[PDB]
Design a protein around this motif. Structure first.
Motif, PDB file in Angstrom:
ATOM      1  N   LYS E 177     -98.217  27.920 -34.619  1.00 45.54           N
ATOM      2  CA  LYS E 177     -99.623  28.000 -35.009  1.00 45.54           C
ATOM      3  C   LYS E 177     -99.823  29.033 -36.112  1.00 45.54           C
ATOM      4  N   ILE E 182    -101.907  23.959 -36.861  1.00 51.28           N
ATOM      5  CA  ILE E 182    -100.947  23.793 -35.778  1.00 51.28           C
ATOM      6  C   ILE E 182     -99.839  22.791 -36.117  1.00 51.28           C
TER       7      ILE E 182
ATOM      8  N   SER F 141    -103.982  25.862 -28.900  1.00 45.52           N
ATOM      9  CA  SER F 141    -105.124  26.024 -29.790  1.00 45.52           C
ATOM     10  C   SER F 141    -106.366  25.381 -29.185  1.00 45.52           C
TER      11      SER F 141
END
Ligand SMILES: Nc1ncnc2c1ncn2[C@@H]1O[C@H](COP(=O)(O)OP(=O)(O)O)[C@@H](O)[C@H]1O
Ligand SMILES: Nc1ncnc2c1ncn2[C@@H]1O[C@H](COP(=O)(O)OP(=O)(O)O)[C@@H](O)[C@H]1O
Ligand SMILES: Nc1ncnc2c1ncn2[C@@H]1O[C@H](COP(=O)(O)OP(=O)(O)O)[C@@H](O)[C@H]1O
Ligand SMILES: Nc1ncnc2c1ncn2[C@@H]1O[C@H](COP(=O)(O)OP(=O)(O)O)[C@@H](O)[C@H]1O
Ligand SMILES: Nc1ncnc2c1ncn2[C@@H]1O[C@H](COP(=O)(O)OP(=O)(O)O)[C@@H](O)[C@H]1O
Ligand SMILES: Nc1ncnc2c1ncn2[C@@H]1O[C@H](COP(=O)(O)OP(=O)(O)O)[C@@H](O)[C@H]1O
Ligand SMILES: Nc1ncnc2c1ncn2[C@@H]1O[C@H](COP(=O)(O)OP(=O)(O)O)[C@@H](O)[C@H]1O
Ligand SMILES: Nc1ncnc2c1ncn2[C@@H]1O[C@H](COP(=O)(O)OP(=O)(O)O)[C@@H](O)[C@H]1O
Lengths: 215, 215, 215, 215, 215, 215, 215, 215
Positions: E177, E182, F141
């Motif tokens: 990330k 990502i 994320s």
């Protein structure tokens, strides 16, 4: 050997004097400043809440034969502490009383000795002022006493054989303090100068008589 | 003749005792309950603020030869009153001290006598506590004193000539109290029984010595 | 008329029950939640430290004839509160004891009645469990009592004249409760069915005998 | 036959009294000092954590018909122990409750009897307080009861036939206790002196009436 | 589908988050302010005592597949409510535990899941302090785990083929990330910059090794 | 290296786990029972008031790189302790927050990390509830995550190549836990049996899709 | 020329400011840390007990025209030192007062100026609180004063000739402070914007009137 | 409207003055003597610990727009009190600072105004002493000020037009106080006699110049 629980005007003096005499004293106080101030005037000094028994146990309060409870403004803390100490089988518990009530409840909860410092000092001041001559004294009984006196002009340059107190008043002179110098059991040839200390011994009324006509 | 300005634990006792002795005392106090409580223990009792000059004038405080300032918890009333009284040309001003400081400022503002009741009673209790035997005493000086003792078993059936204190310890026996009966300046043939009062006189350390080896 | 100082398991019950009976009760508690919870179970409810005298004065505690001191975990607060109340000339002071010591000191500081709830409940329960039959009872004296019993099969369909307790055991039957219906001072013709309540009266040992052989 | 799991103010009393009655009791406690203190007041005394199942098994807790769970300050030990005991098929589990909750969960987890000692002692004391005279009592029903009374001056030197309670108030006198001496089912010629115990039986309101006009 | 009974620090968060995820949640609370505050963070919000069965019936609590009992300061409300819910045949009951005990009794009274939030958070925080690098993680087993790491200077501008973890340490990189962007299952040509998230997977000790020598 | 200031539900766990991992931890607590209980779960355990600076100095708190401030009931003590530690230049100060306000003031007084355990555990539990299947997970994320799943019957005896997640759903299987045994990065020939642990990795919505159609 | 005897919150500031103004100041203190801390903020800094005369002589205290007695924690050091200084014919002795008393005794023992810092700052802040608008002011006499005001919205974009204070209220505007820029004795054409400083001068009641109707 | 939390040298004066102005003030104090002493100098006076939140709630502290925190010797209690007040959304919290640190932490925890009384009095005395003429003053800004002056012999019988300050020094004369009589905004013909009050206004340094050459 001695423990002082309240380091105030009264207890602090007891601690300081006991320490001065050469005895080992453990001073206790909830106020840190008091404990710090009496660090030099005691064998050991501890900050502790006297209202909690476990703290008293931490102090090792049982290792003492005499524990002094000197807490003045708070009757609560006084009687309660006295109680906790009475639980721990302390041989001698001496407590300061604030009033008649305090004296009563301390009396009932097993206080060994109850002291009214102001009062006793009060009778001392009262007797010391009633007759301007007496500096200090001790009462042997209700009728007989030993008295310390401040010599006036009437006694200046007078001899012991001149002031025949042993026959005329039935009292006996014990000591003469002149300019700091001291004479114990003085001979009849000795002279008494004014402003000196004169130690007489006998009956109260007779001493009063001698004060009256002699000085 | 005498005026007591603070009717508390200390001043109230002075007032009560002076009244008991037969002297005329004017009791002052800012608290009405105190004044009411000491109405019977004084010639006159007045509510007045000792810090207020006009009130002092109203009391006729100048008509007194002795004015006692006994206010403890509040240094204000004590030193301020002492000051005002020093202004009014009071012949004798006796004030209770709280600490070293109070003693100092009272000393400088012209106090005739400064009393530390808790301190002196403290050292008295200290001496009484160091030895259980001493019942009472009087200090003639920094080194010499007369001590009252409670006779133990070591002194039972002992004669004065047996306990040669006048030579071996340099101290002199003054009186013997037996079952309330009293003997003043006893002859060497006299017997001392236990639990009796023994009045010795001499140097502190020497008396302590006699206490150590004798009793 | 009644004041409850500790609103816990014990005192809270006293307050609630006294209020239920129709008496006016002032509930005190240092814990606010407790005070709030007993607002509906008291005439008045106040947050106050029972160890602080002026708070007690603020409560108007002197206006009460009965003040109950129910503080459990803290012996300090208990004896202290009892003490303060004893100062204020409270006519009747009832206090919970924690142990033998607590009972002693409460006894000495002038408690009018000292209650050991656990102990008394313990003996009540002990008598109630030791015998499967006893539902409830009352002790007239150390030796004599009235006992409530649960009838077993041995007593089923038995008459009072059949079970001659007045002669065989020297005890007397007072009441019989059958299916909720009640019979007071029943005639000898009356029948006792099992699982009914039987109220006997007499000497403890005799009642035990009747229990042993009879039921 | 009986097991006491918590040796505190409540459970300890149950154990001691049960042992005094002559029953065999096994006392359990997590605290060693408690176990030691109740060694003389129990057949056996064991140190064990009541929250630990294997310890309970080690105690042989299944061999008992009655197990008393008396742990007060900690609800944890109480309900957990009660739970473990309910698992082990204990015939009778009696537990001390702290509050409404404790009663609820004990009720649901299969407690045979839940005791609020302070509450019931509270209502007993409460009835004892509403009337200063009633020393003890027993309720036969919602309306009928037997009451123990403290004779006042109004009852002094009064005969039973004089105080016609059987007709005027519909109540019946059962016993009279005079200086410890006891009289059961007394004849109408008998005299009642003040400060004696008087055992009346009947309706609550009627008893109240007799109390009101009679004494 | 979901019901939250205690709207506090714990339960309130569960309610708010479940509501945020799009699920329908009924929030319960005895405190009105809480109910008002969570009105916007729940489908419905009701004031109700969770200890009262009829109130629970009024809530329609049976219509829910998941009921969460989150009451912290009060063990009472928690276990009692859990009990009542177990009575009403709730499919899934999840309760917050305060201690070992709470866990025990909830376990026995049929709690579907017992949570010690602080404890588990404790092991997470413990790992977070033990290692400066790990942001988050998941344990596959006692020995194997997946770890999220915060890239240091040692990893800056380094390629996956440069850091041969699959052979040298036997672990595998899963994701990278970078600035919020990502990369899932990245190819060996990919670059790792510092302060980025690095997702490694493998044996705990091996991951620790890679942390030691690699970063 | 690590210091835990509050030994409660939260901090105590941190201490215990840090100790379990093999790190040296100094546990602090004002409550003696807590300190005693964590004696075995820490290198050292000390009784100390975290609000008192001199006590902190006595602890040698400066010798630590990580100090954890965990206070539940008292926000005052929390912020004050954090403050004193910030004074002593502690490198890392992690504090438990009670609410938004607490978070704010801790933020301003230089807290290095602020933890809301209930909140984070709350959202974790929330995701755990949203899907009955998810045993554990980690969020890479806002959109991407790795998820641990409990295999159902729909996945029983299914191969990885059969469940083509890498193409059909764009997610990747990472690990399979089978009868406690573990398989890392499994080959497409591997079989998944029900009730096994399945570790998938990818987009949240995609994982949800796979859950929907696959299992 | 100037000597500061107590280096605390009050005296330390006096020393620092006098030093900043360019005057030569000798700082005294019994505390070594204080003396060390003010070494840079004074010409000379000495450790000395202000209650000890010989130490004062060692300081050369007579060489100063102004000696400031600022000792806080006890009245002792303050009045005793002031007394000693009055003894040594110090030209100007300025002392900080603790209460009415301190002011009185300092007044009588010849203090040249007695300062109540808290009292005057307190009444000024009090004036600042009674009216939020007044930032500061100075009293020319019992009736007349100059006042600094915080302009409100009612005064925004208003001209001096618009607010004819010189005639309508008999007060005069002296200065206008706008964004730090300052205008002294402004012409009638000048504009007053809100949140600016406005300096008015006149009678207290008139200024209050202008505040009332004007702003 | 106003609440004073600390009744000491500082806060007590604020309370007394606010009460004197006619505003309603609630005085708080943990010490009973202080509360009693300020009973007459406040609308209401309460004994309360400012560090205890529930007590603050009991005071109804939220009903006040201004709460003053004046606790001197304890920084802990000060910041904690300020903290609790910040929790209760008090509009204005004014706190006395002890030192730089205290100022900082009060600043960070959201104190609305922080006061250093002694410092300001120190700088006032500092300005007041170099020239006896400055009795008091007020700073309009960092550079400009209004000064009150005591006229010397150099200014005796001098006219305003003679002492052309408006041009020669750029300062302006505002008022002349002669024998208590006052003249506001005096005409150039007016005479200034020595030892009278002269109110000048202008630049600080310029005023200093005028003092130097002029007076
Ligand atoms: N609860 C308490 N626990 C321990 N010490 C106390 C407590 N309350 C007061 N004290 C101590 O007792 C002392 C009281 O002194 P003071 O009021 O002068 O009595 P006295 O006049 O008998 O000396 C104080 O120094 C204080 O430190
Ligand atoms: N300014 C004053 N004027 C007159 N009497 C005062 C003044 N201040 C205090 N007093 C009285 O002095 C008494 C002090 O007694 P107390 O505190 O018991 O002193 P002590 O402890 O030395 O006996 C109080 O009863 C009070 O009424
Ligand atoms: N100093 C005090 N002043 C007033 N109330 C108190 C004080 N200390 C304790 N209490 C109250 O007494 C109660 C104690 O109840 P508890 O411990 O349950 O006793 P019990 O078991 O006899 O009912 C508490 O609710 C507490 O609020
Ligand atoms: N887990 C446990 N197992 C066994 N005994 C316990 C346990 N917890 C507490 N106890 C005992 O129970 C007793 C509690 O007594 P106490 O607190 O006085 O209750 P009460 O106030 O109801 O009499 C303590 O003496 C303790 O030794
Ligand atoms: N009997 C009850 N019924 C419903 N809600 C309750 C009950 N008891 C407590 N609560 C609620 O639970 C909440 C407790 O929250 P808190 O003490 O912060 O727990 P936690 O720290 O686990 O979040 C309180 O806000 C209260 O409103
Ligand atoms: N002023 C203080 N100084 C030191 N320790 C404290 C202080 N106040 C509370 N503590 C400790 O903090 C602990 C509180 O923990 P707890 O309320 O369980 O927090 P959590 O819920 O986060 O575990 C208590 O065990 C207590 O001993
Ligand atoms: N006997 C003394 N001689 C000299 N300096 C002293 C003496 N006693 C106290 N001081 C000093 O006076 C200072 C008093 O400061 P502080 O207590 O802040 O007073 P205030 O609050 O009035 O400013 C202390 O820093 C101390 O070092
Ligand atoms: N914890 C507390 N809660 C409430 N009031 C307090 C607390 N601690 C001190 N006080 C009060 O604050 C006052 C302190 O005043 P003082 O020391 O004279 O400060 P200053 O000189 O700055 O006014 C005392 O009168 C005391 O009663």
């Amino acid at each position: 050997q001695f423990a002082v629980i309240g380091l105030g005007r009264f207890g602090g003096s007891i601690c300081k004097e006991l320490h001065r005499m050469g005895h080992e004293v453990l001073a206790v106080d909830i106020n840190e400043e008091k404990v710090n101030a009496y660090a030099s005037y005691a064998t050991h000094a501890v900050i502790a809440n006297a209202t909690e028994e476990n703290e008293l146990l931490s102090l090792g309060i049982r290792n003492f034969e005499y524990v002094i409870v000197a807490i003045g403004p708070n009757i609560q803390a006084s009687t309660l502490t006295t109680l906790l100490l009475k639980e721990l089988d302390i041989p001698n518990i001496w407590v300061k009383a604030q009033n008649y009530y305090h004296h009563k409840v301390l009396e009932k909860i097993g206080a060994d000795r109850i002291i009214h410092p102001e009062k006793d000092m009060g009778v001392k001041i009262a007797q010391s002022l009633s007759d301007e001559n007496v500096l200090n004294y001790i009462d042997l009984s209700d009728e007989y006493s030993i008295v310390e006196l401040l010599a006036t002009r009437k006694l200046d340059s007078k001899s012991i054989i001149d002031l025949n107190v042993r026959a005329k008043y039935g009292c006996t002179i014990l000591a003469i303090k002149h300019h700091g110098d001291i004479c114990l059991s003085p001979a009849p040839e000795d002279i008494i100068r004014e402003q000196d200390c004169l130690v007489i011994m006998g009956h109260k009324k007779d001493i009063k008589r001698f004060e009256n006509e002699g000085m």
